Structure formats: structure tokens, C-alpha cells
Amino acid sequence: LTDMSCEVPACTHSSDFGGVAIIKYAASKKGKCAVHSMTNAVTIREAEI
Amino acid sequence: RGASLQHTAPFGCQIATNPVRAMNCAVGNMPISIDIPDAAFTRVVDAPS
């Protein structure tokens, strides 16, 4: 996963998963890579893309 | 009988009686509140970029 450029199209401070983050990332191989919340204040709804 | 309100209508009104109604009274600010449905509100994940 190289050149993962993330733009936050959706950001509400709300109770649900109010973060909508579109990361254009270049995959070296086709597969499910884990998504890790680097921010403790965020919660990634999905796990592997 | 003289000129009536149909001729002498100041303010750009359109006076028409029986019932007495000034259609096209060109004056004021018209407060209109549109409570619209939520279904039009398609966010950036839904929208074209």
C-alpha cells in the first residue's frame, strides 16, 4: 500500500461513525490489508480493505 | 365615479374586488420556511466530486 493519500470528505462530531475518509492508495498486490486507527480519538468502522 | 383602484393602484398593486384582494401587492419581505426532507441531502460520499 503505497502513496495512500487520504481526503476526509465526511467529518461530523457525532455518535455514529461520522468519519468518511477516501484514501486513494496504490496497492502493490491485490488483497485485504488491515486498516488501523492511528488516532485514539477516531474509530475506523471497517477493518480490512 | 372617477378613476378607481383598478387604475389608481399605487405601490404597483393589482386590486381586484369581489372578494377584495390585492393580487401582486409589490411590497414586503415574505418569510417562507421550507422544512424539506432529509433524502435530498446526499453527502460527499454520495456526491460527484
From TrEMBL, chain A:
Domain of life: Viruses
Location(s), subcellular: Host Golgi apparatus, Host trans-Golgi network; Host cell membrane; Host cytoplasm; Host endoplasmic reticulum
Signal peptide from the UniProt entry: none
Function: Provides the signal sequence for the translocation of the precursor of protein E3/E2 to the host endoplasmic reticulum. Furin-cleaved E3 remains associated with spike glycoprotein E1 and mediates pH protection of the latter during the transport via the secretory pathway. After virion release from the host cell, the assembly protein E3 is gradually released in the extracellular space.
Subunit structure: Homodimer. Homomultimer. Interacts with host karyopherin KPNA4; this interaction allows the nuclear import of the viral capsid protein. Interacts with spike glycoprotein E2. Interacts with host IRAK1; the interaction leads to inhibition of IRAK1-dependent signaling.
UniProt-recorded name of the protein: Structural polyprotein
Species name: Chikungunya virus
Taxon lineage: Viruses, Riboviria, Orthornavirae, Kitrinoviricota, Alsuviricetes
Span of the entire protein shown here: 1105 to 1153 of 1248
